[PDB]
Amino acid sequence: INDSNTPLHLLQPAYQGTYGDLTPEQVKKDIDRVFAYIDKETPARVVDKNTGKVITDYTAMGDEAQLERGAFRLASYEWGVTYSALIAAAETTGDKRYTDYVQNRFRFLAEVAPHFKRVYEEKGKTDSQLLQILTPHALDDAGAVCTAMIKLRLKDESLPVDGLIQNYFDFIINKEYRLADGTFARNRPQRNTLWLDDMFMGIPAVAQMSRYDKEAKNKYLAEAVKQFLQFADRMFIPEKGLYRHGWVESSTDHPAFCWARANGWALLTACELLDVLPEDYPQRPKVMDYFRAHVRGVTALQSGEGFWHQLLDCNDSYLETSATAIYVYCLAHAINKGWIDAIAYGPVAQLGWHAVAGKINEEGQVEGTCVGTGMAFDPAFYYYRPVNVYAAHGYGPVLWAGAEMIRLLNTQHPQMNDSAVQYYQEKQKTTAPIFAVDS
Amino acid sequence: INDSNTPLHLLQPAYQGTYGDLTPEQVKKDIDRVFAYIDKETPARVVDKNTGKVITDYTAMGDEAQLERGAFRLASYEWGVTYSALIAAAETTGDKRYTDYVQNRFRFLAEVAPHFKRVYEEKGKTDSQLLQILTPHALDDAGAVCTAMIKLRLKDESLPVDGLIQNYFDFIINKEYRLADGTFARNRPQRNTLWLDDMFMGIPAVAQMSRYDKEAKNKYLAEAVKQFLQFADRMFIPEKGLYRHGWVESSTDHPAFCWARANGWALLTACELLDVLPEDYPQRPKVMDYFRAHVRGVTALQSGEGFWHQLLDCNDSYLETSATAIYVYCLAHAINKGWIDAIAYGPVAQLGWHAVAGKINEEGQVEGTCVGTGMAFDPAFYYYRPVNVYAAHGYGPVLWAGAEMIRLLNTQHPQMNDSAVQYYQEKQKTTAPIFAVDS
Amino acid sequence: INDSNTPLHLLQPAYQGTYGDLTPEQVKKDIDRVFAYIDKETPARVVDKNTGKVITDYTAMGDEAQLERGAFRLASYEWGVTYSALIAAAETTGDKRYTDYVQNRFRFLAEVAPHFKRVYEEKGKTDSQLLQILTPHALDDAGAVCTAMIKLRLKDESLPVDGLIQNYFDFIINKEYRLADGTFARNRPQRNTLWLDDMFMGIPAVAQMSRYDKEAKNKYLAEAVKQFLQFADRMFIPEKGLYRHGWVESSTDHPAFCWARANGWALLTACELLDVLPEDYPQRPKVMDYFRAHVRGVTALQSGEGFWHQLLDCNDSYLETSATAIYVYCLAHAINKGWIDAIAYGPVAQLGWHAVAGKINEEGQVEGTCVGTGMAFDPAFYYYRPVNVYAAHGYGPVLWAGAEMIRLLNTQHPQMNDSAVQYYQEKQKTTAPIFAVDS
Numbered sequence A, B, C: 001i002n003d004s005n006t007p008l009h010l011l012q013p014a015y016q017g018t019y020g021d022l023t024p025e026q027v028k029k030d031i032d033r034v035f036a037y038i039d040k041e042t043p044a045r046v047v048d049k050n051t052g053k054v055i056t057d058y059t060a061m062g063d064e065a066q067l068e069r070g071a072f073r074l075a076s077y078e079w080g081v082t083y084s085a086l087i088a089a090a091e092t093t094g095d096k097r098y099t100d101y102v103q104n105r106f107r108f109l110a111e112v113a114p115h116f117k118r119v120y121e122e123k124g125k126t127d128s129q130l131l132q133i134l135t136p137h138a139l140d141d142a143g144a145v146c147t148a149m150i151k152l153r154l155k156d157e158s159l160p161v162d163g164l165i166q167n168y169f170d171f172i173i174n175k176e177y178r179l180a181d182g183t184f185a186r187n188r189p190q191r192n193t194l195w196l197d198d199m200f201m202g203i204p205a206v207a208q209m210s211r212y213d214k215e216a217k218n219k220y221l222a223e224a225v226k227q228f229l230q231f232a233d234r235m236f237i238p239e240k241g242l243y244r245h246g247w248v249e250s251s252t253d254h255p256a257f258c259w260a261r262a263n264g265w266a267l268l269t270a271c272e273l274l275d276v277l278p279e280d281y282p283q284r285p286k287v288m289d290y291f292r293a294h295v296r297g298v299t300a301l302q303s304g305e306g307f308w309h310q311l312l313d314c315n316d317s318y319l320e321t322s323a324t325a326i327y328v329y330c331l332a333h334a335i336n337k338g339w340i341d342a343i344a345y346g347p348v349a350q351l352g353w354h355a356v357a358g359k360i361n362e363e364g365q366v367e368g369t370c371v372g373t374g375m376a377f378d379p380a381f382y383y384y385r386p387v388n389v390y391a392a393h394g395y396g397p398v399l400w401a402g403a404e405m406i407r408l409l410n411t412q413h414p415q416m417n418d419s420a421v422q423y424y425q426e427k428q429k430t431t432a433p434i435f436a437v438d439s
Helices: A024-040 A077-093 A098-122 A130-136 A143-155 A163-176 A197-212 A216-236 A260-275 A284-298 A323-338 A342-356 A379-383 A392-411 B024-040 B077-093 B097-123 B128-134 B143-155 B160-173 B197-212 B214-235 B260-276 B284-299 B323-339 B340-359 B379-383 B394-412 C024-040 C077-093 C097-123 C128-134 C143-155 C160-173 C197-212 C214-235 C261-274 C282-297 C321-337 C342-357 C379-383 C393-413
Strands: A046-048 A065-067 A193-195 A246-248 A416-419 A420-422 B046-050 B066-067 B193-195 B246-248 B415-417 B420-423 C046-048 C065-067 C194-196 C246-248 C413-416 C420-422
Touching: A024 A077, A024 A098, A024 A342, A024 A392, A065 A098, A065 A130, A077 A098, A077 A143, A077 A392, A098 A130, A098 A143, A098 A163, A130 A163, A143 A197, A163 A197, A193 A197, A193 A216, A193 C261, A197 A216, A197 A260, A216 A260, A216 A284, A246 C420, A260 A284, A260 A323, A284 A323, A284 A342, A323 A392, A342 A392, A342 A420, A342 C194, B024 B077, B024 B097, B024 B340, B024 B394, B066 B097, B066 B128, B077 B097, B077 B143, B077 B394, B097 B128, B097 B143, B097 B160, B128 B160, B143 B160, B143 B197, B160 B197, B193 B197, B193 B214, B197 B214, B197 B260, B214 B260, B214 B284, B260 B284, B260 B323, B284 B323, B284 B340, B284 C321, B323 B340, B323 B394, B340 B394, B340 B420, C024 C077, C024 C097, C024 C342, C024 C393, C065 C128, C077 C097, C077 C143, C077 C393, C097 C128, C097 C143, C097 C160, C128 C160, C143 C160, C143 C197, C160 C197, C194 C197, C194 C214, C197 C261, C214 C261, C214 C282, C261 C282, C261 C321, C282 C321, C282 C342, C321 C342, C321 C393, C342 C393, C342 C420
Parallel strands: none
Antiparallel strands: A046 A065, A193 A246, A416 A420, B046 B066, B193 B246, B415 B420, C046 C065, C194 C246, C413 C420
């Protein structure tokens, strides 16, 4: 084996993860494993908190009743993402089990919410999970879930979630704290702080409400855009093509910690907003320009393992799964929508999927996901955020990425060429390992 | 332990070093350990170089006499930093032992210098340590020590260091080699070379002399500023917010090796100069702008361990203690002075202190300090500079950083919020792990 | 051993590879080891492909005849580089063995080519290595070899390579696929793709043909420049000072994978072109500006080990030998030619040579060379390219770098100063470890 008798250029590279060909059947097998797992870990039942006995007489129950505790909460913002993912997966795969799940959980929450409200009113206390639904106090308690409920209800008028949607959205649009200019804000950890996460916690709900409330379509399109641009003005870093995680209004400098998951939330927000805006919307160009600039900054920092780093621009920080999945979804979606180039980005998405699929264990858990994480102004905090299989943030994104990869693989015609994944818009009529595209 | 039954977001991160709360008492305990150590390793006595017998009849001694050799030289530029550090520490802590040390060493050097001069004149030879004091040949032999002597003498007219100050400063201002435009320069390793280190070796002395010589105040303020800006024009790299270690006038390109300690010296020079300049000094804005830009470039490159890298912009180069300490001092000082934002930078300084305190061993030595280091035009030289507990460069900076951290902690009200260090200007009236700041 | 009794600043650093002084004799010893090895692995004989029996009656042979297979192919583009390297090495060292080798191989190929053509015409098949020579189909099949043949023939009118040169160049200039604007291009892996490698596969041949065909000098100088600038417009990344490996015309974004070897090919192309252009050529300034900007971008990313990384701007990608060697050649050449500064770059080249020489094993093989590598749009492909001693790409560059380092060391007067390699244009009259340059 030498230069004269071997194509050294065709030697099998020693990848640590998987590389190369991907079939939509394999992607579906993997999201089905995650789906089967989360299905059994998100029970839609009321039980006695002391004995675990199933409660079915909701009119009679009291402060002993709670939602059965599986590994993941049904109405956390993390699960808001899962619900949106499964709505999308039903569409790209045609597997109605995915939407049956969302139907079932939403109908269950709609059914029981009023009874728990009555318990709270009579007893002064109830399941803390129900207080999140009934009395949200932050966009984290409302937006992602509200967004998914709007999406499904617009596909099914029989879905009885209007009461929940109105409650959630009344909080978002009328009660949530904002800066003087209206930008969704927090007073933690500092007064008048913007969190990159709130682009995603707040904007998709507003964008979807423009579709749900006919009377307020223009008003909500404009508010969704206004939020987007008021956040991006302050938080985007044009020199890097990345967003800072936080921005404190009083601070005279605004240090950038380009945390991967929140950068995922910003990329996903652009996708959610661009899914709704009319193609001739007058501010669409500015939003699209921001999206495209962010795509370029994020993708340049993909690691050799296909994952992205916890701090995106710090290649000594750990590789994190949930952000990686979010980016894969966004990139596949943007290619599918015609927003970004398939030749340039298809292989990025594909490699990212290989990376993510390698973290779906035999049980269907998603490994390597950063746990719930707030805002810091030092790098040690970010570098050392724990990872755990039970961090709920991994699940939605993996499902959504898989769903979108199936669409991408069913539309495009990727093929290995010279040992590299290449995207082709027409099927190449060759099995040669190295080839030129015909005229 | 899962998403439903655990706050995974409150799990204890597996830090390698310490993180979080810091009390001024702990900082003081640590600088006291360093102080006790250096006190016993910097003897202020004359001994016979052959027998070690203590010499007290200075009028009678000859070329056998030398300063007793402890681990660290009393009048090296490294110890010039230590003296300035201890002057500062006495002020922020109120511990007069720190200034007693400086008083003692300076009075000893003032006392013996004239006798060693007489030995040199009569015998043609004396202790090489005394030749550095009596006949300096480089800013390294004069500036940092002269600066500290001016600082203390202005606080104590009984301190008999005027002869030493005049000798040192005559060298600096009249004998030191300069470029055509007056910028302090060297002819090593190449003709007409600027060393970033000389910002610190030369400028603070000139700035302090403006305070010491009433007649020449304006002249020395102007020269200090002129040096600063003539160095920064050539050596600052605006695209990085960092300084190059060296600049050779003849070279048509000026490669940047952003060596951490010398970048510390440049940051410290800005602090020393800004401590002296009137707030309405006409060139102060340009100096402040340079300082602020350097702060932003340095802080962005802090590692996940709180240390900075030997080459700042090379995250594969070793983490170095002395530079880290210098940055901590500069950042705490700038916050204390109102030059930079506390919310943005307090946690940077605090993490850096945790990092540094972890390198103060039980003996009181400072580990991980880069040894004396000249100028190169290749990266291997910088990457492989040895570290040693006896590198004197670590001591001053750790003491000075600790002193300034005590001030910072006694003024600000930092507190953990959502597992991250946050700086508050008013004490928050809560022990909740996660909280919003009140209106 | 402490601060008072030891120059800690003069302690021996624990380098992993070699550092410091380099003699032209040592460099020559190392290239002689590589040369002896490749000499025995590149046999210039025809043999029966079944038995290995040497064939000397070329007029009588048939489709059984092939070039004897040693470890490296005689007319691959990799060996085109080797031939140019050895022409250069003969000049800087005066060792005629180097040019005797090239003479021998070129005369052998000139002698046998017509016989193999006759076999191909009569039998319909022949040695695939001869089909590359006789019927090139890509610049890889022609340019580098053609370039070397022109170079030697212009030094020796008796070298009977005009038929091969005309055949190769007819392909390059008239048959090779180009973009609409004339830029040499490929239709793999995508339609209308530019490969950074083709700067080197195509431009030097065109530049040399301007010297070989008197009638077409102006025409070929202009075409060489036009190619250079049409490639660089699209492929250079001014913000990084680096080139992207690929550029697909249809893509709306052009992702940058700054692959080290192809960046070497672009740097080498500038050297080959600048060797030919008149110093008053009207577009020379634009070419020189591109060269100088690339020098600055490449050199800033040299690792602490002296090697450069497989993806230049990804410090977590492997250190690669062939690119490193190419850069060393380019830098030494540019210093020797007066194009870049010796003080700034001599130590870069010198360290790079130490790095490369450490990969020349006792057998004379070159270790750590990336195998033949095509174009990807994901980083995993690049990060995981295999390395192999039989990758032919290492040999030419090491030889050429060594040859040019000998010239550099025989012209300049480098010397250790303060433990760092420093370049001096006049021999310094001192053996002191640390010194100032005299007035």
